[PDB]
């Protein structure tokens, strides 16, 4: 978990509630949880 700034607990919670979570590189250049994808697959 130390490799990237993801905050895996929020990721797991969001996945369990059923969101389509997105993780990736931001303007900082650090991997983080971006916004969830809505509606379409």
């Amino acid at each position: 978990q130390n490799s990237v700034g993801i905050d895996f607990l929020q990721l797991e919670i969001a996945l369990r509630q059923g969101y389509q979570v997105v993780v990736g590189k931001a303007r900082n250049g650090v991997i983080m949880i971006l916004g969830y994808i809505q509606s379409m697959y």
Partner: protein
């Protein structure tokens, strides 16, 4: 959205109050900040003291 040390309800003495502190956030890889916020449970749906009363 970062907590700016104004939200902290301090209990330490006056001479220990930081003038400028920022919460450590997962953005920027937690490499900057001064404090963190802890909570008893990640998701809090049940009262532990009620479980003791039930048994």
């Amino acid at each position: 959205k970062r907590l700016t040390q104004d939200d902290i309800t301090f209990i330490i003495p006056d001479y220990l109050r930081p003038d400028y502190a920022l919460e450590i956030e997962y953005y920027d890889n937690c490499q900057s900040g001064d404090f963190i916020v802890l909570r008893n449970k990640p998701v809090n749906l049940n009262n532990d003291y009620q479980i003791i009363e039930h048994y």
